[PDB]
């Protein structure tokens, strides 16, 4: 208990699988990740938090509502139109015979296939270089090639391509941890927020202090920032903001978000998930503030593979997924910004947080 | 006062405009119904109150959110896959400049396109003939072409096209009144309900009651049904189910839905909007018994061009609209029932009430 999985990530949890597709150069910054749970499907929930959403089918991850688990959720770049990548997921999905059964005959199903969009408009520098449907589509197919337990690929990949958080270039981050119970918690964030994942008086990330130890070791930012370090941090961040509202034509991005998707091996509920899903935003505060301001479309996912029973006892057990649910999107979101690498475009001027501080 | 509209339908509140386009034949019986609010776009909200929506941008339209207007509403056939249909919607409305603003470009917009599907797989013969972003796209640039206070076209048309009532052929239906203020409350309907719209025990429309004088004297049917028309329209319909269930691979269909868009003059704040989206549901109760089963994907938009204003006062000028909102919906569910033709294709035979009663 209280240490990370094997690969300290979202396919921790057995059986669930990670895709990411993306499309860069050519005027283009974008893509799409796709979580895939393993046949059978999930049990999911929804907490959209965000004043300034962009989503697909979440009415249908109510409790009251019919479906009781699905198979994929779509995480995309392209604002509303990125939408779009949601329909080619469905279309794989019904072709390998996955949704809910409608008929006595196993190959009709309809699929449902939540989906929650960030902005990154013009990140590439074209306009109209948004995720289509193929490019969804390619984004499930990858996730269903892999393995299970396979490391999840962090940075700018899928839908973090094209993320950028508080100016600082964001990305696709992961952490897990293990319960004293034996279950996996985890999480997978990307991380496009207004606000700062860094506290602008000391330069240290808010999340760090959330970490499990020796988790960031490997991307080598120096225990203590000096205070110069921060000052021209500070001043090499502002220009590239400067910069970048210049090169664009209605300036700096409008729209904000940070998605994610919670998963654990322990059994919920649908109403046990989304209680797990607004947990879940708790951590996001914590590594990112201002968050769930009217320009941010933040949406959480929840997971439950339900192969591990939760066992005031049933209170107490959901209540350690609870807690973990928070903890390990905090995580995810350190991870994103320390994986992420600094991208140049006609679009923008986005440099990463280690460009700054390492 | 307590009178239609010009053309007892959802373009007598002005600026309004309907789209329709379908595919029949080869295979196909499908199709998609566009809302299109004048320029400047309309306030909006949600009320999805079935048990299997299919949806899309509903969190977008929650009061507390950003984007205050929006300009379509999409309904359409082929259930969830049909919700491809809605980014067709939003390419056009990108390409006519509309949508919230995301520069100081005015070129720069994010259309808010919700959208809502109904389950029509397969009767035309064709399980995979689902509408697309093409069909989506030629229902608003459908919807566009027309005037102001254009006459809608009811029946089996847009969204309607697939559409079966309890066994009966269903489709598009609309209806309209007139305030004692002067604003208009309309409501158009795509009536796809597991339930009946028929009293089992009479044959008489439920929602018949709630009609304005003369409004369905049009459509031709007896005053007074008697007892072996009843007893010869039963024992039709249940054998056109028998038929239905044989020719079906899986069978008769397992997810229904009413789908609804209600629209008013008055101007209403988006928690107003919402409350008439709820009370809107209550006539959808009056006109088809049961509602709301887990098997319905039941969904009402509800729109307002803000052009009249609304004057314990305000209170009872707003009753008046919620009430009106309910009675239209009943109106527009009698109307699609009433106006539909009976189709046979390999994927369902499904009378038409007339035929039947008339």
């Given at each position: 208990?209280?240490?990370?999985?094997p690969?300290?990530?979202?396919?921790?949890v057995?059986?669930?699988?990670?895709?990411?597709?993306?499309?860069?150069?050519?005027?283009?910054?974008?893509?799409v990740?796709?979580?895939?749970?393993?046949?059978?499907?999930?049990?999911?929930?929804?907490?959209?938090?965000?004043?300034?959403?962009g989503?697909?089918?979440?009415?249908?991850?109510?409790?009251?509502n019919?479906?009781?688990t699905?198979?994929?959720?779509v995480l995309?770049?392209?604002?509303?139109?990125?939408?779009?990548?949601?329909?080619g997921?469905?279309?794989?999905?019904?072709?390998?015979?996955?949704?809910?059964p409608?008929?006595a005959d196993?190959?009709?199903?309809?699929?449902?296939?939540?989906?929650?969009?960030?902005?990154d408009?013009?990140?590439?520098?074209?306009?109209?270089?948004?995720?289509?449907?193929?490019l969804?589509?390619?984004?499930?197919?990858?996730?269903?090639?892999?393995?299970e337990?396979?490391?999840?690929e962090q940075?700018?990949?899928?839908?973090?391509?094209?993320?950028?958080?508080?100016g600082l270039?964001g990305?696709?981050?992961?952490?897990?941890v293990?319960?004293?119970s034996?279950a996996?918690?985890?999480?997978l964030?990307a991380?496009?927020a207004?606000?700062?994942?860094?506290?602008?008086?000391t330069?240290?990330?808010?999340?760090?202090r959330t970490g499990?130890?020796?988790?960031?070791?490997?991307?080598?930012?120096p225990?203590?920032?000096?205070?110069?370090?921060?000052?021209?941090?500070?001043?090499?961040?502002?220009?590239?903001?400067?910069?970048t509202?210049?090169?664009?034509?209605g300036?700096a991005?409008?729209?904000?978000?940070?998605?994610?998707?919670?998963?654990?091996?322990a059994?919920?509920?649908?109403?046990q998930?989304?209680?797990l899903a607004?947990?879940?935003h708790?951590?996001?505060?914590?590594?990112?503030?201002?968050?769930?301001?009217?320009?941010?479309?933040?949406?959480?996912?929840?997971?439950?593979?339900?192969?591990?029973?939760?066992?005031?006892l049933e209170a107490?057990?959901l209540?350690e997924?609870?807690?973990?649910?928070?903890?390990?999107?905090?995580?995810?979101?350190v991870?994103?910004?320390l994986?992420?690498?600094?991208v140049?475009?006609?679009?923008?001027?986005?440099?990463?947080?280690?460009?700054?501080?390492?």
């Amino acid at each position: 208990g209280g240490v990370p999985g094997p690969h300290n990530g979202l396919t921790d949890v057995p059986g669930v699988r990670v895709g990411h597709a993306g499309r860069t150069g050519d005027g283009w910054l974008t893509g799409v990740t796709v979580v895939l749970a393993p046949p059978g499907g999930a049990v999911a929930a929804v907490d959209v938090r965000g004043g300034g959403p962009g989503t697909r089918e979440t009415d249908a991850l109510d409790p009251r509502n019919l479906v009781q688990t699905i198979d994929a959720v779509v995480l995309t770049g392209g604002s509303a139109f990125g939408l779009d990548a949601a329909g080619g997921v469905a279309a794989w999905l019904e072709e390998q015979g996955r949704g809910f059964p409608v008929g006595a005959d196993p190959s009709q199903v309809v699929p449902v296939v939540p989906a929650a969009a960030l902005f990154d408009l013009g990140r590439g520098g074209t306009w109209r270089a948004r995720p289509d449907a193929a490019l969804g589509r390619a984004a499930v197919e990858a996730a269903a090639a892999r393995p299970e337990g396979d490391p999840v690929e962090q940075g700018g990949v899928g839908a973090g391509t094209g993320a950028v958080v508080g100016g600082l270039k964001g990305g696709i981050g992961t952490a897990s941890v293990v319960l004293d119970s034996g279950a996996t918690v985890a999480a997978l964030a990307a991380v496009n927020a207004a606000g700062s994942a860094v506290d602008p008086a000391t330069g240290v990330l808010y999340g760090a202090r959330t970490g499990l130890p020796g988790e960031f070791a490997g991307y080598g930012v120096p225990d203590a920032i000096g205070a110069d370090t921060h000052a021209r941090a500070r001043a090499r961040l502002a220009e590239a903001a400067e910069e970048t509202a210049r090169r664009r034509a209605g300036g700096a991005a409008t729209l904000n978000a940070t998605l994610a998707v919670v998963a654990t091996d322990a059994t919920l509920t649908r109403a046990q998930a989304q209680k797990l899903a607004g947990t879940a935003h708790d951590g996001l505060a914590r590594a990112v503030r201002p968050v769930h301001l009217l320009s941010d479309g933040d949406t959480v996912f929840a997971l439950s593979t339900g192969r591990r029973p939760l066992l005031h006892l049933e209170a107490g057990a959901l209540n350690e997924v609870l807690a973990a649910g928070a903890d390990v999107l905090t995580r995810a979101v350190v991870h994103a910004v320390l994986a992420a690498t600094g991208v140049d475009t006609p679009g923008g001027v986005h440099p990463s947080y280690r460009e700054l501080y390492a």
